[PDB]
Amino acid sequence: HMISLIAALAVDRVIGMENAMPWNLPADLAWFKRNTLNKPVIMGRHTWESIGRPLPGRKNIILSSQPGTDDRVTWVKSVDEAIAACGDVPEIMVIGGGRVYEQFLPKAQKLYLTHIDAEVEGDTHFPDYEPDDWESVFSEFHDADAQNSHSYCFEILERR
Numbered sequence: 001h002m003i004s005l006i007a008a009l010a011v012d013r014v015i016g017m018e019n020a021m022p023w024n025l026p027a028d029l030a031w032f033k034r035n036t037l038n039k040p041v042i043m044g045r046h047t048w049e050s051i052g053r054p055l056p057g058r059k060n061i062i063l064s065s066q067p068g069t070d071d072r073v074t075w076v077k078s079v080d081e082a083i084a085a086c087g088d089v090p091e092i093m094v095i096g097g098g099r100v101y102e103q104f105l106p107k108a109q110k111l112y113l114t115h116i117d118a119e120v121e122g123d124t125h126f127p128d129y130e131p132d133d134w135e136s137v138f139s140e141f142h143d144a145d146a147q148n149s150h151s152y153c154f155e156i157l158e159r160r
C-alpha cells in the first residue's frame with residue numbers, strides 16, 4: 001500500500017521547535033485536512049500529544065514503544081506494524097514528527113510539502129529528501145495575505 005508523508009517546512013526544513021510549530025500558517029491547515037481526510041494517519045507519540053484529540057474522519061495510528069494511553073486511537077510499536085494497522089487503503093498519510101518522517105521517507109511514494117517562508121530555528125527537521133529520488137508534480141506559490149504572515153508554496157513530489 002502507498003505511503004505518503006505530509007509536512008509543513010520552514011527554512012532549514014524546520015518542522016518543530018519545543019514540541020510545537022514555531023511559525024503559523026492558517027492556509028496550511030486546510031491543505032493538511034484536504035490531503036489527509038478519510039485516510040489513515042501515522043504519527044509518533046509526540047505528534048499525537050501535540051494534537052490532543054484524534055484527527056476526526058481519519059484512522060489515527062500512533063507509534064510508541066510503550067503501551068497505549070488512549071483508546072480513541074490505534075497504538076503500534078514499529079513502522080511495519082503501523083503500516084499493517086492501516087489495512088488495505090489506497091494511501092497512508094504519515095503526519096510526523098521528525099523521527100517518524102525519517103523512518104517512513106524510504107517507504108514513501110509521495111510527499112505533500114508546504115514550504116513556509118519563515119526564518120525560524122528548531123531542533124526538529126524534515127528528513128533530507130534526495131532531489132535525485134523525487135519528482136515535483138505540483139507546485140503552487142502563495143504570497144502572504146491577511147491570514148498568513150508568510151508566503152508559502154504547496155508542493156507534491158512523487159518518488160522516482
Ligand SMILES: NC(=O)c1ccc[n+]([C@@H]2O[C@H](COP(=O)([O-])OP(=O)(O)OC[C@H]3O[C@@H](n4cnc5c(N)ncnc54)[C@H](OP(=O)(O)O)[C@@H]3O)[C@@H](O)[C@H]2O)c1
Nearest residue numbers: 007008015016019044045046047064065096097098099100
Ligand atoms: N511541521 C510538521 O509538518 C510537523 C508534523 C508533526 C509534528 N511536527 C513537530 O515535530 C516534532 C515532533 O517530532 P519528534 O521527532 O519530536 O517526535 P515524533 O516523531 O512525533 O514521535 C516520537 C516518538 O514516537 C515513538 N516512535 C517513533 N518511531 C517509533 C518506532 N519505530 N517504534 C516505536 N516507537 C516509535 C516514540 O515514542 P516512545 O518514546 O513512546 O517509544 C518516539 O519517542 C514536534 O516539534 C512537532 O510539533 C511537525
Ligand SMILES: Nc1nc(=O)c2nc(CNc3ccc(C(=O)N[C@@H](CCC(=O)O)C(=O)O)cc3)cnc2[nH]1
Nearest residue numbers: 006007008028029030032033050051055056095096
Ligand atoms: N503537514 C502538517 N502540517 C502541519 O501544520 C501539522 N501540524 C501538526 C500539529 N498542529 C496541529 C494543531 C492542532 C490541530 C487541530 O486542532 N486539529 C483540528 C483542525 C486541524 C486543521 O486545522 O486542519 C482537527 O481537524 O481536528 C492540528 C494540527 C501536526 N502535523 C502537521 N502536519
